[PDB]
Scaffold this active site. Structure first.
Site, PDB file in Angstrom:
ATOM      1  N   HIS A 291      25.039 167.165 -49.298  1.00 56.55           N
ATOM      2  CA  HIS A 291      23.682 167.470 -48.862  1.00 56.55           C
ATOM      3  C   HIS A 291      23.398 168.667 -47.974  1.00 56.55           C
ATOM      4  CE1 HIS A 291      22.788 163.561 -50.583  1.00 56.55           C
ATOM      5  NE2 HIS A 291      23.775 163.057 -49.862  1.00 56.55           N
TER       6      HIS A 291
ATOM      7  N   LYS B 186      25.075 163.605 -61.659  1.00 55.25           N
ATOM      8  CA  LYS B 186      24.352 162.854 -60.639  1.00 55.25           C
ATOM      9  C   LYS B 186      22.896 163.102 -61.051  1.00 55.25           C
ATOM     10  CE  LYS B 186      24.484 161.812 -55.751  1.00 55.25           C
ATOM     11  NZ  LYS B 186      24.121 162.412 -54.446  1.00 55.25           N
TER      12      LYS B 186
ATOM     13  N   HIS C 119      25.188 159.246 -44.725  1.00 55.83           N
ATOM     14  CA  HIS C 119      24.490 158.951 -45.971  1.00 55.83           C
ATOM     15  C   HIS C 119      23.066 159.465 -45.912  1.00 55.83           C
ATOM     16  CE1 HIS C 119      21.866 155.829 -48.141  1.00 55.83           C
ATOM     17  NE2 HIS C 119      22.479 156.452 -49.133  1.00 55.83           N
ATOM     18  N   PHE C 120      22.603 160.068 -47.008  1.00 52.45           N
ATOM     19  CA  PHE C 120      21.230 160.563 -47.082  1.00 52.45           C
ATOM     20  C   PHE C 120      20.416 159.415 -47.679  1.00 52.45           C
ATOM     21  CE2 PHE C 120      17.460 162.674 -48.684  1.00 52.45           C
ATOM     22  CZ  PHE C 120      17.208 163.624 -47.693  1.00 52.45           C
ATOM     23  N   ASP C 121      19.445 158.932 -46.926  1.00 51.39           N
ATOM     24  CA  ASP C 121      18.680 157.806 -47.406  1.00 51.39           C
ATOM     25  C   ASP C 121      17.415 158.153 -48.169  1.00 51.39           C
ATOM     26  OD1 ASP C 121      18.916 154.954 -47.494  1.00 51.39           O
ATOM     27  OD2 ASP C 121      17.135 154.875 -46.212  1.00 51.39           O
TER      28      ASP C 121
END
Length: 124
Positions: A12, A41, A119-121
């Site tokens: 990210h 992805k 983590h990218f939420d």
């Protein structure tokens, strides 16, 4: 060898550019970041801010994550981001993406010690 924190950076973080100009940024980046090597992805967001600024988010607004956990944080202000969404004609091994630039608040889950984003939420 790669940790959860290093992984979040690879998936990210793009502190090189400030904007994802060129509709081919996603095509290039998704491949270079190894996000198309074992499958395409379908969606991925890149954040165009310094590591220090995104790390600081773990000390900002605590909010619930999309899955219901509570170890998520929302950034104080909007940040430059790029949305990469697979196109309807993309097909592994030839993944193809549509690049979308925006300025939104990002939400990330943090963990570990040092406490960093892992983590990218979501972006809101």
């Amino acid at each position: 060898k790669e940790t959860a924190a290093a992984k979040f950076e690879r998936q990210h973080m793009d502190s090189s550019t400030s904007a994802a100009s060129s509709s081919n940024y996603c095509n290039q980046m998704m491949k270079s970041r190894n996000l198309t090597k074992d499958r395409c992805k379908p969606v991925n967001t890149f954040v165009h801010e310094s590591l220090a600024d995104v790390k600081a988010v773990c000390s900002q607004k605590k909010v619930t994550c999309k899955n219901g956990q509570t170890n998520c944080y929302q950034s104080k202000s909007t940040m430059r981001i790029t949305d990469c969404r697979e196109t309807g004609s993309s097909k592994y091994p030839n993944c193809a993406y549509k690049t979308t630039q925006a300025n939104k608040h990002i939400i990330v889950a943090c963990g570990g010690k040092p406490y960093v984003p892992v983590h990218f939420d979501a972006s809101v």
